[PDB]
Design a protein around this nucleic acid. Structure first.
Ligand SMILES: [Mg+2]
Length: 49
RNA sequence: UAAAUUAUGGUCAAUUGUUAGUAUUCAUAUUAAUUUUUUUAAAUGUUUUAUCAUUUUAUAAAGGUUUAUUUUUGAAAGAUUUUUUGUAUAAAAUU
């Protein structure tokens, strides 16, 4: 009975903390995102002849 | 071919753990799997001016390809001084 109780709140905390955890791990990657690639400029740069 | 010189009148050792620094496993370690994790969907407001203008704002990517590199006198710094003057443009060297 308690093993299902441990499994229930782990999925309950996952539904609540899906949105705020996705914002912090996005901002943690943006600090390491020095000189991101612009993909629409490389695809327009390959189009030029 | 110098021929054994004669108080042997001083023996009682070494080890108390304190070091002038590349040290070797042909089978173990590095790689991918038994395991990876987390995101991202473009379409964009730099600003002051004397106003249809003028003053300040000098290294984004792909492509093409390089033996090598750095420092403006000029703009600013910057001053009760002033000449667009204050030695920047080069060499050796190693695919
Ligand atoms: Mg000056």
């Amino acid at each position: 009975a308690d093993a299902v109780r441990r499994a229930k709140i782990r999925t309950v905390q996952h539904t609540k903390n899906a949105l705020p955890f996705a914002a912090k791990k996005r901002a943690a990657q943006r600090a390491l995102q020095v000189r991101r690639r612009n993909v629409r400029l490389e695809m327009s740069g390959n189009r030029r002849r």
